[PDB]
Design a protein around this ligand. Structure first.
Ligand SMILES: [Cl-]
Ligand SMILES: [Cl-]
Ligand SMILES: [Cl-]
Lengths: 212, 214
C-alpha cells in the first residue's frame, strides 16, 4: 500500500483552516492514523481510526475519510501547530507511513537582530578560527549573508545553519560561520558580515577589527 | 503514563550487528493490548516500520529488512530489543521503540536514538565560548569536531530556555560535525548572572560545562 500525502508543504496564517490529504493505493477502510512530528521529536498520535480524536489532543484537530481518500484538518492554526504531519495505514502488514506534509506559518515580516562573534582565544589556540554571524528572530526564512575579509568577497569558506520555525513567535534564526585556519585568519584585519533581508530597507553590516 | 527509552551504540561499523534495547518504565510489558514496535526514520526512507513483537514472543517483520531482523523481548526486565545484522550506510537513521495498540495505533514513542553506520571512530567535541560583544546581549557556544551525531546543548542545566537557539549541526570538510548554540540575555545581567552551556555527546560519553564570560 503506497501512501500519498498532499501537499508536500504549505504556509498558512495563524487562525487559518488547514486541510491536508492522504491517498492510499488501495482500499484500507478506516485503518488510518494521523501523526504530528515537530523537529527533533518523535511523532505524536493525534487521530486514530481515520476520525477518532486521541485523548488529550485539542479539538481543533480532526480527520475523515474512508476507502482511499482521507483528510486531516486544523480548524484554527495555532503557533505551536507547526510540524510535519503523517498518515499511517494498518490495513495489513507491513505498516507504512505517508511522505508527510510540512505545515509552516506565514507571519508578518520581522527583521533580524545581527550579531558578530570573533573567534575566542582558546579556539585560535587549537589552530582553527570560526567567525560567526548571528541573525536572531526574523521572518521570512530567506536571507542572504555575505562575508567580507578586507572588503574582499568570500566564496566557499562559509557555512550556514538555520533553526526550525519557532513554535511561539514563528520566526527563524540563522548562524553563518566563516571558517579559516589560524594562519589565514592572522593575514587580515577587518572581518565583515553583510545581511540582506526582506525586513531591512537596506543591507546591514556588522564587522570588527581582528583583536577586539 | 508509560515511558519508552532506547539505548545502544550510536556508531556501528559496516557488516557489523546493530543492537538496540528499549526499556519500558512505569508499566508492564506483558500486556495483550500492545505490540512492542521498532520504527526508524532517515531522510532517504522517511518513517519506516521495522517490525514488532508480542509479549508471547511472536514477531512480525517488514519484508524489506526480514533477512537481517531479530526482535526479542525480556518480560522480566521489561525490555525488548532490535538486532540488525549486515548493516549498510542505508541503515543510518533515527531508531524509535514504539508501543503499538493491537487495534492499530503508535500511541507512545521513545525519544529515538541516532545510529550512524561508519568505519570511523567516535570523536568527542571541543567546546569554545562565544563571548558577548556588547540593549540585549548575545552569547553562544561552539561545539566542533565531533562524530557522530548528535550533540545536545542546554544552558544553566536547563533552567535557561527563553531566548535559546541551538542550530542544526553542520558537516565540515574534515568529515566531522560542528554545532552552535546561542542565547540572548539582557546586557544588565552579564555582571550578576553566570551563563554555562552544558554540552553532551553521548556516543563518546563527553560532558562539558563551558562558562561564557564577557
Ligand atoms: Cl593584517
Ligand atoms: Cl573543550
Ligand atoms: Cl540540543
Amino acid at each position: 500500500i503506497q501512501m500519498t500525502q498532499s501537499p508536500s508543504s504549505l504556509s498558512a496564517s495563524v487562525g487559518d483552516r488547514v486541510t491536508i490529504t492522504c491517498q492510499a493505493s488501495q482500499d484500507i477502510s478506516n485503518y488510518l492514523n494521523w501523526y504530528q512530528q515537530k523537529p527533533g521529536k518523535a511523532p505524536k498520535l493525534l487521530i486514530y481510526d481515520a476520525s477518532n480524536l486521541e485523548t488529550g489532543v485539542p479539538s481543533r484537530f480532526s480527520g475523515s475519510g474512508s476507502g482511499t481518500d482521507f483528510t486531516f484538518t486544523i480548524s484554527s492554526l495555532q503557533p505551536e501547530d507547526i510540524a510535519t504531519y503523517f498518515c499511517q495505514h494498518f490495513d495489513h502488514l507491513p505498516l507504512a507511513f505517508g511522505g508527510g506534509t510540512k505545515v509552516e506559518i506565514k507571519r508578518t515580516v520581522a527583521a533580524p537582530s545581527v550579531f558578530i562573534f570573533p573567534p575566542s582565544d582558546e579556539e585560535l589556540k587549537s589552530g582553527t578560527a570560526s567567525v560567526q554571524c548571528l541573525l536572531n528572530n526574523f521572518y521570512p526564512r530567506e536571507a542572504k549573508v555575505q562575508w567580507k575579509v578586507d572588503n574582499a568577497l568570500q566564496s566557499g569558506n562559509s557555512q550556514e545553519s538555520v533553526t526550525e520555525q519557532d513554535s511561539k513567535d514563528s520566526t527563524y534564526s540563522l548562524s553563518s560561520e566563516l571558517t579559516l585556519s589560524k594562519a589565514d585568519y592572522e593575514k587580515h584585519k577587518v572581518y565583515a558580515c553583510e545581511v540582506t533581508h526582506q525586513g531591512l530597507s537596506s543591507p546591514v553590516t556588522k564587522s570588527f577589527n581582528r583583536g577586539e | 503514563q508509560v515511558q519508552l527509552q532506547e539505548s545502544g551504540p550510536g556508531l556501528v561499523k559496516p557488516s557489523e550487528t546493530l543492537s538496540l534495547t528499549c526499556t519500558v518504565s512505569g508499566g508492564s510489558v506483558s500486556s495483550g493490548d500492545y505490540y512492542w514496535t521498532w520504527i526508524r526514520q532517515s531522510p532517504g526512507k522517511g518513517l519506516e516500520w521495522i517490525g514488532h513483537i508480542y509479549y508471547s514472543g511472536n514477531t512480525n517483520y517488514n519484508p524489506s529488512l526480514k533477512s537481517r531482523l531479530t526482535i526479542s523481548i525480556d518480560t522480566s526486565k521489561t525490555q525488548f530489543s532490535l538486532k540488525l545484522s549486515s548493516v549498510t550506510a542505508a541503515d543510518t537513521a533515527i531508531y524509535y521503540c514504539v508501543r503499538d495498540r493491537v487495534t492499530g495505533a503508535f500511541d507512545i514513542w521513545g525519544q529515538g536514538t541516532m545510529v550512524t553506520v561508519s568505519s570511523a571512530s567516535t570523536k568527542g567535541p571541543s567546546v569554545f565560548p562565544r563571548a558577548p560583544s556588547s540593549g540585549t546581549a548575545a552569547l553562544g557556544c561552539l561545539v566542533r569536531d565531533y562524530f557522530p551525531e548528535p550533540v545536545t546543548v542546554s544552558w544553566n542545566s536547563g533552567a535557561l530556555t527563553s531566548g535559546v537557539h541551538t542550530f542544526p549541526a553542520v558537516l565540515q570538510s574534515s568529515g566531522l560535525y560542528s554545532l552552535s548554540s546561542v542565547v540572548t540575555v539582557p546586557s544588565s545581567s552579564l555582571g550578576t548572572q553566570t551563563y554555562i552551556c552544558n554540552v553532551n555527546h553521548k556516543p563518546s560519553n563527553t560532558k562539558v560545562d563551558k562558562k561564557v564570560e564577557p
